[PDB]
Design an enzyme around this catalytic site. Structure first.
Site, mmCIF file in Angstrom:
data_model
loop_
_atom_site.group_PDB
_atom_site.id
_atom_site.type_symbol
_atom_site.label_atom_id
_atom_site.label_comp_id
_atom_site.label_asym_id
_atom_site.label_seq_id
_atom_site.Cartn_x
_atom_site.Cartn_y
_atom_site.Cartn_z
ATOM 1 N N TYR A 162 -13.820 -11.323 6.683
ATOM 2 C CA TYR A 162 -13.803 -10.893 8.087
ATOM 3 C C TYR A 162 -12.639 -11.480 8.903
ATOM 4 C CZ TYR A 162 -17.571 -14.190 6.717
ATOM 5 O OH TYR A 162 -18.339 -15.134 6.064
ATOM 6 N N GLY A 163 -12.368 -12.772 8.711
ATOM 7 C CA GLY A 163 -11.216 -13.412 9.321
ATOM 8 C C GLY A 163 -10.972 -14.836 8.853
ATOM 9 N N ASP A 205 -28.393 -15.500 2.311
ATOM 10 C CA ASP A 205 -27.230 -15.899 1.495
ATOM 11 C C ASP A 205 -27.078 -17.398 1.397
ATOM 12 O OD1 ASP A 205 -23.621 -15.080 1.196
ATOM 13 O OD2 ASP A 205 -25.062 -15.312 -0.346
ATOM 14 N N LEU A 255 -9.292 -23.909 8.740
ATOM 15 C CA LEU A 255 -10.371 -24.740 8.238
ATOM 16 C C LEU A 255 -10.986 -24.017 7.064
ATOM 17 C CD1 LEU A 255 -10.928 -27.348 9.790
ATOM 18 C CD2 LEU A 255 -12.743 -26.105 10.981
ATOM 19 N N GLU A 310 -10.386 -19.651 5.479
ATOM 20 C CA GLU A 310 -10.038 -18.241 5.638
ATOM 21 C C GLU A 310 -10.940 -17.428 4.715
ATOM 22 O OE1 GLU A 310 -5.352 -19.446 6.388
ATOM 23 O OE2 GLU A 310 -5.828 -17.543 5.402
HETATM 24 C C1 3C3 Z 1 -14.712 -23.407 4.696
HETATM 25 C C2 3C3 Z 1 -15.122 -22.682 5.987
HETATM 26 C C3 3C3 Z 1 -15.806 -23.630 6.980
HETATM 27 N N1 3C3 Z 1 -16.661 -22.867 7.932
HETATM 28 N N2 3C3 Z 1 -17.015 -21.687 7.761
HETATM 29 C C4 3C3 Z 1 -17.787 -21.335 8.794
HETATM 30 C C5 3C3 Z 1 -18.392 -20.106 9.022
HETATM 31 C C6 3C3 Z 1 -18.129 -18.938 8.297
HETATM 32 N N3 3C3 Z 1 -17.284 -18.801 7.270
HETATM 33 N N4 3C3 Z 1 -18.853 -17.932 8.777
HETATM 34 O O1 3C3 Z 1 -19.616 -18.450 9.848
HETATM 35 N N5 3C3 Z 1 -19.296 -19.829 9.971
HETATM 36 N N6 3C3 Z 1 -17.869 -22.372 9.623
HETATM 37 C C7 3C3 Z 1 -17.142 -23.349 9.086
HETATM 38 C C8 3C3 Z 1 -16.991 -24.616 9.625
HETATM 39 C C9 3C3 Z 1 -17.801 -25.050 10.684
HETATM 40 N N7 3C3 Z 1 -18.742 -24.313 11.301
HETATM 41 N N8 3C3 Z 1 -17.499 -26.310 11.005
HETATM 42 O O2 3C3 Z 1 -16.458 -26.719 10.122
HETATM 43 N N9 3C3 Z 1 -16.176 -25.611 9.248
#
Ligand code: 3C3
Length: 262
Positions: A15-16, A121, A10, A12
Site C-alpha cells: 500500500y505504501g 492476519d 521504517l 516499506e
Molecule cells: C516494518 C514496518 C513497521 N511498521 N509497520 C506498521 C504498520 C503497517 N505496515 N501497517 O500498519 N502499521 N507500523 C510500523 C511501525 C510502528 N507502528 N511503529 O514502528 N514501526
C-alpha cells in the site's frame, strides 16, 4: 513533512510505507503509515476499525488526514521493532520470553474479540515491540467486524497468510472468526518456541501437516518444544474448529499458567 518531520523510512510495503515522524518542537515521536489512494474503500475501513481501538497491546491510533490522495494514519511508534526479529531461525527464543509475549498476545486478542473485531492476519511481522518490549498488535488492514449488536456474522472472504491460516478457511465456504485467530496464535507460539513454521499451509496435500494430525511429534518443529507448551499446542492446532480450545480455556492451560520469568 506534515507539522512533523519524517526522519527515517521504517518499513516499506504494498500500500505504501511507514515513516518515523517527530515534532521538531515537542520532540514527540510517532509512526505514520502513508497510503496513496491512487496506487479508497478499505483504508476507510482500516481507520474506522482503528478509531474503535484502545488497549495497551494494540498499536495506538492518534489520527488521520487526507493531503491529496495521500492518507496519513498516525500511529504509536514501536521502537523495539517486530517480534519476528526476536525469533532466532531454527532456535526460537527462551521459553520465558515466549510465554510473556504469548500472554500479551492473548490479552490483545481477547480485547479485539471483546469488541467484535477480528484481526485476521496475526503473525510475528504484525506483532510490534515498544521500548519496554511490550507486544502490540499492528496493521488492521485486513481486520473486520464479526459481531455487531451482539449477533455473530460468519466470515466468507479468505485472507491472511498461508502458514498462519486455519484449515477451515481453506475448506469451508463460511467459518467463525474467533477460532481462526486462535489457530494463528498457535502458529506464532510454535515459531517462538522452534524458530521455524510447521507447514506451508494446513492442507491434506501438505506432508508436514499430515504428520502432525498423525501425531508424529518426534519430527522437527515439535521435537524442539517440550511437553508443557506442546500440550497447549495440541489443543490449539485442532483441525475441527468446534473442538479447538478457546481463549478462556487457554487461560486455564498448565503451561500458560507456569511460573517461568523474573
Ligand atoms: C516494518 C514496518 C513497521 N511498521 N509497520 C506498521 C504498520 C503497517 N505496515 N501497517 O500498519 N502499521 N507500523 C510500523 C511501525 C510502528 N507502528 N511503529 O514502528 N514501526
Amino acid at each position: 513533512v506534515e507539522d512533523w518531520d519524517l526522519v527515517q523510512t521504517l518499513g516499506e510495503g504494498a500500500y505504501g510505507e511507514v515513516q518515523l515522524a517527530v515534532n521538531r518542537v515537542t520532540e514527540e515521536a510517532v509512526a505514520v503509515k502513508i497510503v496513496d489512494m491512487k496506487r479508497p474503500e478499505n483504508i476507510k475501513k482500516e481507520i474506522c476499525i482503528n478509531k474503535m481501538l484502545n488497549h495497551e497491546n494494540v498499536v495506538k491510533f492518534y489520527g488521520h488526514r487526507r493531503e491529496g490522495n495521500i492518507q496519513y494514519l498516525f500511529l504509536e511508534y514501536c521502537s523495539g521493532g517486530e517480534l519476528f526479529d526476536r525469533i532466532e531461525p531454527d532456535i526460537g527464543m527462551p521459553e520465558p520470553d515466549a510465554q510473556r509475549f504469548f500472554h500479551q498476545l492473548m490479552a490483545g486478542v481477547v480485547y479485539l474479540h471483546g469488541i467484535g473485531i477480528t484481526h485476521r492476519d496475526i503473525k510475528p511481522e504484525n506483532l510490534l515491540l515498544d521500548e519496554r518490549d511490550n507486544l502490540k498488535i499492528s496493521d488492521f488492514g485486513l481486520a473486520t467486524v464479526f459481531r455487531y449488536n451482539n449477533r455473530e456474522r460468519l466470515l466468507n472472504k479468505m485472507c491472511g497468510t498461508l502458514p498462519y491460516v486455519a484449515p477451515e478457511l481453506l475448506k469451508r465456504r463460511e467459518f467463525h472468526a474467533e477460532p481462526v485467530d486462535v489457530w494463528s496464535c498457535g502458529i506464532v507460539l510454535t515459531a517462538m518456541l522452534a524458530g521455524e513454521l510447521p507447514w506451508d499451509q494446513p492442507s491434506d496435500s501438505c506432508q508436514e501437516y499430515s504428520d502432525w494430525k498423525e501425531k508424529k511429534t518426534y519430527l522437527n518443529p515439535w521435537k524442539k518444544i517440550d511437553s508443557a507448551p506442546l500440550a497447549l499446542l495440541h489443543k490449539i492446532l485442532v483441525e475441527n474448529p468446534s473442538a479447538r480450545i478457546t481463549i478462556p480455556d487457554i487461560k486455564k492451560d498448565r503451561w500458560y499458567n507456569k511460573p517461568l520469568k523474573k
